[PDB]
């Protein structure tokens, strides 16, 4: 736990859950982890993170045109979102 708090700070966490820790005579074993990490400190931790794709919450599959202008957010500076709340609605 001591190193883990240094692990909580030198990797700039927000949320870090171990449920449960199965520790036997053989040693300690972690089964669950749940993590929220601060990406605004990327200038501290991209040397430590690397080629990270951040997985979405497990939801429906993303469309190719939100992918293209979302790529354009990765290309340029804008903030987008386009995600459909029901695709066969009338109020766009």
């Amino acid at each position: 736990i001591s190193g883990l708090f240094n692990f909580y700070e030198d990797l700039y966490f927000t949320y870090l859950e171990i449920n449960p820790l199965v520790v036997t005579k053989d040693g300690v074993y972690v089964l669950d982890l749940a993590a929220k990490v601060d990406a605004t400190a990327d200038y501290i931790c991209k040397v430590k993170w690397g080629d990270i794709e951040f997985p979405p919450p497990f939801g429906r599959e993303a469309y190719p045109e939100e992918a293209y202008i979302a790529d354009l957010d990765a290309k340029s500076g804008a903030s987008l979102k386009l995600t459909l709340l029901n695709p066969k609605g009338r109020i766009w």
Binding site: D42, Y43, K46, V47, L72, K75, S76, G77
Partner: protein
Amino acid sequence: WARELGLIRKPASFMTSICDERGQELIYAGMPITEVFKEEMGIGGVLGLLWFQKRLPKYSCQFIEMCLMVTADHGPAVSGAHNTIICARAGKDLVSSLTSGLLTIGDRFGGALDAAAKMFSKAFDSGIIPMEFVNKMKKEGKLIMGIGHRVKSINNPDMRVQILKDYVRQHFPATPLLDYALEVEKITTSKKPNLILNVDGLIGVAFVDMLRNCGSFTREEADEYIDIGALNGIFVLGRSMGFIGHYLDQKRLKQGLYRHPWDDISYVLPEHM
């Protein structure tokens, strides 16, 4: 007559390791002028012979002529071409107008060639990760020379940065200083979207890449050509083309004297000195 027969002595100055004019042919650095035209080195070849006194390879002279084709005029608003249009608009001559317009290539306009070569060479050879070199510059002021464009930012690419870059990607081995500088491009695009490596920075670093990454230069020839200031000259000779183009255009449109109206001035003279 005494030296025609040889009896007196004279020590000579002006040591000129270049361009033997006397004899039966105009010799350049070491090559006759018919051998200039029969080996078919262009003006990149004669810039190799005149500036470095070295026969550069056939991808290098093609890069130097492409390089002089992009370091031409960058429009009449910028400082030196502005002074050319003022001096041409006073109706002086070609040479005085070009001369007063070239007398502006310094450290704030168009001298990102030499500064963006000296600084990137000093950063790569005393090597830091660029994610800490940018912080080392951040602790000192003095912004990284040769990075930043107002409109064409990234994947709205500068396309004179890219036509040079796709020359440096294709016909051009060994690019660790632009691999390093493109890594600086990757990392300084994290602070700002626009903030791409300049064209007057890219010519400096791609030309250091040419000088110490192709042959013919050891590392004491190559550092002396950067310390002396041979990278100012590429921008100067490119921009002279656009300055004389501006001169001929300001004579052809038949314009008279410019005056610069007073409601753009804001005289902030003291009270009573």
